[PDB]
Design an enzyme around this catalytic site. Structure first.
Site, PDB file in Angstrom:
ATOM      1  N   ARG A 177      33.475  26.121  16.711  1.00  0.00           N
ATOM      2  CA  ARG A 177      34.126  25.044  16.003  1.00  0.00           C
ATOM      3  C   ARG A 177      35.219  25.619  15.093  1.00  0.00           C
ATOM      4  NH1 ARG A 177      32.892  22.767  10.384  1.00  0.00           N
ATOM      5  NH2 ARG A 177      33.803  20.683  10.328  1.00  0.00           N
ATOM      6  N   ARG A 199      43.924  11.488  -1.914  1.00  0.00           N
ATOM      7  CA  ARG A 199      44.114  12.623  -2.827  1.00  0.00           C
ATOM      8  C   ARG A 199      44.660  12.169  -4.174  1.00  0.00           C
ATOM      9  NH1 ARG A 199      41.421  17.246  -1.363  1.00  0.00           N
ATOM     10  NH2 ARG A 199      42.188  18.127   0.617  1.00  0.00           N
ATOM     11  N   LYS A 210      32.974  11.609  14.386  1.00  0.00           N
ATOM     12  CA  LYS A 210      32.275  12.058  13.199  1.00  0.00           C
ATOM     13  C   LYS A 210      32.115  10.847  12.355  1.00  0.00           C
ATOM     14  CE  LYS A 210      33.911  15.809  10.978  1.00  0.00           C
ATOM     15  NZ  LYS A 210      35.092  16.594  10.389  1.00  0.00           N
ATOM     16  N   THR A 214      25.843  19.948   8.910  1.00  0.00           N
ATOM     17  CA  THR A 214      26.167  20.134   7.483  1.00  0.00           C
ATOM     18  C   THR A 214      24.976  20.491   6.570  1.00  0.00           C
ATOM     19  OG1 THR A 214      28.183  18.801   7.784  1.00  0.00           O
ATOM     20  CG2 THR A 214      27.487  19.230   5.524  1.00  0.00           C
TER      21      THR A 214
END
Ligand SMILES: O=P(O)(O)OC[C@H]1O[C@](O)(COP(=O)(O)O)[C@@H](O)[C@@H]1O
Ligand SMILES: O=P(O)(O)OC[C@H]1O[C@](O)(COP(=O)(O)O)[C@@H](O)[C@@H]1O
Ligand SMILES: O=P(O)(O)OC[C@H]1O[C@](O)(COP(=O)(O)O)[C@@H](O)[C@@H]1O
Lengths: 513, 490, 468, 507
Positions: B60, B107, B229, B287
């Site tokens: 990955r 952001r 995802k 994760t």
């Protein structure tokens, strides 16, 4: 749309999984007991109050460290904080006190650190002249019988599994080993003998004195370390003796012999701690989930309490939120069927003792709803002996009834706890309110999944029927106040046919007044 | 006494639990694919050779950071390490290459930067939020509740307090950020150019997002598998349509746990795994599975728990991120996932799992599915060393993996891409035959079956005299798998 | 909508029952073998051809009565009638011949009664009961052929008559023996021994007729090739209200062992005098198939009845309706849970074939077999789909009727030079049989079971193929 | 081990079969109710006493034949027989009376293949010849299409419709036979529009009310509306009389669900059903109907030709004993005798036989999966009476109780226990005579009629009746002192307050 009731209806476990819904909120009541190790992070009265409000049900005192006067002040602080809620019995949460023993150990002597080279020779000696002269060639131990319990090929682990030795030759008062996994050797290091039948006594000189301190200090339960066979449990029982006869013995399974002799251990104990810490030193770490699930399953099958322990929310020692592996681990212990989950360093010495507790509480409740009660209950029902005992027939009937009408609670009058424990073994979804006048029963009741112990303080009414009713209404008030149910909801109530223990026989379906 | 076969025969799940046995050794073969994030710790050709030997099946690359030149060299290093084993096709292990996109982000520098005012790059935020709506800043570190919404202004009260350019999450909101960002476009083109096997597509919230990734990859990338995802509330809500449009799924727990209460993540995980298992599509658990091993040579007890429970849940593949990208002990993290996955695979309650899967197995007229399910039942009946499947596209072996046999699936293929992409499926061990096409087809078929026999023997999956299942078809080309044989290992 | 396939999808047996649908028609194939006793009603060549066309798979001959000449001519006429169809091997139906023995017996003023069983004092105790004339009289009870309820009767395994009757059966090339009054395993071994080496392939079916046969059922089943639930005599020995317990116990245990079980006696009893049966009789037949009986039986219904042919046709109609109504979903789950992990390739192939058949709802499972064993293995897992067993062995084809689902077909073609083509020929023969019999049509999916080489024991290949 | 408790423990149904043991004896109690058709062989007061002692729970009077006068006298005799035991209330068995309606009918050497005209012209109402046949159903053409089958004389002759008119139809004979006079006509697959009740039925139903019958078995029910019409005829005066709908044709099977919802229970009327539908499909109809009744919790009766040979023979066939066993295993609440008790040579024996079989079959039920399934297919309602009932049935399994004892005014609390199909007998104690008689419809309910006056202290009045139940069970041989039983009571007087379950020893 609540309590995962859609998933609850699934005819298969796969569809049950498929139905799990993050938008389906749990109920208020959390059924899994939370055990918190106390230490400098969580020892003040003020911090213990919040520990209680955050969900601690059992205060664990680890006797590997700390003096008796240190531990007596912890116990004092716990009781000061606990009784600061005593004024209103309806809100009062009982808190138990658990004495976890240091137990028997194998320590090395004094070396300052030596580097061991993988593949090098190292000799273990029982000759006390090398007792304070340990080095990379020679290492002294304090287990004088080690040669009788190991064989050429046997493994010896030093410093919590950091160093791995393999016995290549056995002597009289010495062994010759090859270093598999080297690294930095130090002084006074813990030693484990994977797969060995260790003949150290059930209780050390120090445990003997600590146990007798626990009796004087009126502790509710002992977590007895390094239990390897039923005779070890029986010695702990014997040391506690007459005055400690009502203190519960939770055996800690910490090695291969304890896992293998589990059935006899479980029979003699009041409960079990899957001590994953030391267990994953003694056995391959990739095998620890097997021992946990086997033990939770067998305790579930026996009706005895089981505790999942060690490193459940470990990162929360430094960080204010768990890792995803950690929240997975807590949920999955509840799904396995653990009665209680435990916090060690996370509450004893961590920077976030309160967040850790509050997190086990949030996860426990989410997981309790995700349990596949449909097959769970069927299997426990299937696996339930057909016997003449009226009290068991009554218990199972009440759990069946509670599923049928999705009740707010199962209310149980109990003196000893036993009638409530008998209900808990069938794993109802609804919370079990255990109304008792016995303060010890109320603290110890936290060991069992689903039991919500309430300490009734009303005088005994001269008419026994009135006195029963008085305690049943105490239970209704607690449920209303704590938000478990509301006036008009249906609850199940268990009572017996005369006063004293052992006569539970009566199941009623009642509306909350 | 092995492979938890005493526990396997239990009539109830409860007894199945009670019979789990630490003294019962697993088989050699490990079915759950391991996906390793490559980074500074694992990028060198020499280290990757050891990642492969340790059990890495998929490399990955995380395009949140890195130049194309950096990533191009990583991919090159992965191909060098992989092909250094190519001399012996019997032992050659295929390794796939996965591009994991940066994706859409919000952001900081609430106008559209100090204690007073904060600036954000997402301009449609006021349209997506409401009074009372929550806003998280720097990976859920800071929490905010909007008290008043305006034109290009939000007024908030801080809930949890405690920098520049930090990430913002908007829990429970339908974010209208584009499916594929400007940087994403450039990176997917690089993915095509570099012959990646799969794209892991970040922050998929709905079906149209997957269709957009598919459209951008277009005709040149039409064989690159898209793994969506799931990382936010909307993608859990809209999971069924997202799954339908995708080739597989990643339970992106990191960000998922910033978006939803940490305590609900196990519900979203188990739901997505169950549903992918029901659909026959690959699911990746991702994760912090062995997070502590970034700094420590051994994992916490909750970490080995999580990996085992992921396999027991039904994940096709497990993942490592920082553990292998930048930690101190990457080979160890890999080796540890291999050990646990193998223990946990033996521990699955195949008896009920297989029962429940076939109770959904539709009564189609499709011969390939009927042959696939017969083979799995036959593998349980004789406790076979393996199921061996000839597949051009992988599809024949995917159909077997869907029923979750205990036995390893040796998928024999001449297609390099098919071999690399098979790793996404629980239990598939793809082997890449390099022998020329024999003049006679029957002989060509037998040649690849014997190739698979030699692979299993060489890997210690089985030995001469054991019985294996072999799936072949009645004529050449894809879609004709119809023949199941029980044969002994020569 | 056909073959109770809606009910078949029920996740519970209660819901399975609730979905059973009189408007859901069965398939054409009928899996349960029908056994007919032959007598004056059904012994002419003419009547026998119609018995076969109606669905007779097995001709039972009751040696309680009749001479060897008599029975010799019944068999002669059964073969004449059977072989009148052989011209077209596609439609020809094998018919087995079963010899049912008289077996050991106890026989006979109001003052003194004499019986022929010499050890009767030893085997009985004060309080024990003795029945006379088929349970019509009772002694320790009831006023108005001797049976010894619950006693260990030490009469010989086979009488003198039984020995020459079995000898005659060997001579006459019978396919099976229904051995009367089997109490223990050693009785089965005695019948085996008397049949001897020349009768080694003759199948022994033990008739269970008393309390000892029942109590010692497991050793008896192990030693036999099959079992008859002989409900007639069994209902005299034990209380008649307990007969269904024994029936279901035996059928269950037979299915568990994978050995043939026959339900017998009074299934359509009213049809000896009447042209159609009672509702209790229709119910009894359907439930024997639901229990799991490989075969069902007719005695006086076909031996001496006024309506022999209607009695066969009626069993055929009901069995076919009941076969569809079986709760396969759980039956298969339980069979596959209750069967061992062996290393035997043929067993893994059999079970995978049945799994496949459920998955695509195949029109048949076609199986090549010499001994019949490969087909027996498949029938054991109780597939919905009919099992077309192709054999060149006529004894195999005739004995194959003992097993639920097996439609035995005898291939008449010569062995082809190349083995590949020889196998394909028999597979095509099975395809032609199924199409001609209406079991399935072109385009339908079927399962085909073959081996990797000739000779028995090598079945290892399952293929899912369209009908050509 | 007794009552098949080894087989009871089997994890699988196959193993359960494999464990069924002929040397495992039943308990004394018998849960399946027995309905006996009373006729010339069973009318006498003395015969009826022995019918009751053999195990009759319900006396069926078939109104196909017989006058009001004849039936009134039959009822009187049943009541004289029944009340002869009333002296001892502990040994008194309630007996119910059920009125079975005649229902809507269609009435009139035939060579196979020949033509036969079916005319409705009344000129030929008495000239029924081999060439032309008359029927009394004037709408027959409305519900006949070209291709429809027509059966005459209880299915003995069959015909097919080839041409259609209004007054006539041109048929060709399928199954030939001897055409007699005024014989029965069935129309398979037809939506027959005859009324729910005939003129005669309306009289017989009102006579039923006059006579205070407990239930009506309503013939030829084809749709919800038929049941409503029967309910309208019985009126407010007969509002408590239970309506058991008889399912007798294709239309009733197809519309079973709407019919079930409107009725108080169901008869699987196998006789007439097997004329309408192929005989080989009747077992499907029976199993479907019992299953759906079990699922709805409404009583279902299996009927007709169960011990048929015992009309002439003292002993049944193996197929008949099997048939009674399998009806119980299917889950039928009640089993029935018709000609076997009405007109046969062996009525007492037929009753004793059904009693012996029922008891054996009841032990051989796979309660483990039966209760599991009932309980899975079972709504989560706030109803405390339902939750108490299910808790008592589970409790009874857990301790293998010798009985479930329930106080019920209306019968409802005991019906609710019976629907979870416990192994243990349900002794339902009531002061209500009609409740006690109608409770026989439900598997497992043993009604006992308490006739003690109402005690001033209600707690004592409740205990009086529980002890009455204890006395019944001892006397009946259902259990003995020291045995554990389940007792169901309520928190106050009047219906709908059942909420107390107790596990207690027999005193
Ligand atoms: O899984 P896929 O893509 O359908 O491929 C399976 C194919 O492989 C085979 O076994 C061999 O085919 P090839 O010789 O063309 O590779 C075919 O019979 C079968 O259809
Ligand atoms: O059931 P059986 O007696 O084992 O026979 C099955 C045999 O039939 C075959 O398919 C064909 O064998 P033959 O050519 O010898 O008849 C074999 O491959 C297989 O072993
Ligand atoms: O089944 P039903 O009709 O609801 O009757 C149950 C009733 O019987 C009782 O136990 C007794 O009622 P009575 O005293 O009025 O006869 C009540 O407590 C309960 O509500």
């Amino acid at each position: 749309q609540t309590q995962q009731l859609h998933a609850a209806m699934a005819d298969t476990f796969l569809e049950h999984m498929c139905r799990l819904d993050i938008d389906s909120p749990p109920i208020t009541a959390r059924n899994t007991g939370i055990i918190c190790t106390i230490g400098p992070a969580s020892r003040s009265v003020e911090t213990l109050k919040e520990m209680i409000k955050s969900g601690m049900n059992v205060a664990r005192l680890n006797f590997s460290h700390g003096t008796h006067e240190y531990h007596a002040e912890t116990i004092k602080n716990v009781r000061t904080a606990t009784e600061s809620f005593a004024s209103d019995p309806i809100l009062y949460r009982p808190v138990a006190v658990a004495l976890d023993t240091k137990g028997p150990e194998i320590r090395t002597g004094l070396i300052a650190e030596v580097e061991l080279k993988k593949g090098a020779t190292l000799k273990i000696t029982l000759d006390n002249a090398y007792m304070e002269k340990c080095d990379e060639n020679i290492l002294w131990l304090d287990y004088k019988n080690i040669c009788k319990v190991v064989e050429v090929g046997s493994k010896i682990y030093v410093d919590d599994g950091l160093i791995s030795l393999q016995v290549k030759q056995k002597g009289a008062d010495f062994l010759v080993t090859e270093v598999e996994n080297g690294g930095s050797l130090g002084s006074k290091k813990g030693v484990n003998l994977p797969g060995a039948a260790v003949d150290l006594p059930a209780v050390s000189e120090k445990d003997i004195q600590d146990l007798k301190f626990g009796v004087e200090q009126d502790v509710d339960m002992v977590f007895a370390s390094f239990i390897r066979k039923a005779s070890d449990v029986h010695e702990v029982r014997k040391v506690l003796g007459e005055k400690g006869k009502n203190i519960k013995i939770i055996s800690k399974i910490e090695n291969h012999e304890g896992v293998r002799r589990f059935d006899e251990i479980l029979e003699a104990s009041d409960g079990i701690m899957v001590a994953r810490g030391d267990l994953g030193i003694e056995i391959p770490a990739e095998k620890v989930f097997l021992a946990q699930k086997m033990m939770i399953g067998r305790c579930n099958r026996a009706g005895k309490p089981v505790i999942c322990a060690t490193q459940m929310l470990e990162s929360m020692i430094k960080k204010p939120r768990p890792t995803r592996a950690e929240g997975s681990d807590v949920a999955n212990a509840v799904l396995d069927g653990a009665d209680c989950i435990m916090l060690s360093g996370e509450t004893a010495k961590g920077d976030y003792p309160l967040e850790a507790v509050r997190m086990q509480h949030l996860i426990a409740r989410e997981a309790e709803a995700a349990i596949y009660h449909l097959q769970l209950f069927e299997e426990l029902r299937r696996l339930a002996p057909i016997t003449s005992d009226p009290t068991e027939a009554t218990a199972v009937g009440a759990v069946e009834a509670s599923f049928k009408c999705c009740s707010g609670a199962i209310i149980v009058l109990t003196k000893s706890g036993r009638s409530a424990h008998q209900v808990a073994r069938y794993r109802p979804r609804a919370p079990i309110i255990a109304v008792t006048r016995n303060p010890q029963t109320a603290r110890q009741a936290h060991l069992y999944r689903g039991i919500f112990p309430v300490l009734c303080k009303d005088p005994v009414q001269e008419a026994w029927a009135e006195d029963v009713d008085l305690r049943v209404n105490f239970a209704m008030n607690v449920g209303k106040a704590r938000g478990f149910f509301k006036k008009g909801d249906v609850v199940i109530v268990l009572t017996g046919w005369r006063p004293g223990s052992g006569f539970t026989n009566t199941m009623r379906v009642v509306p909350v007044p």
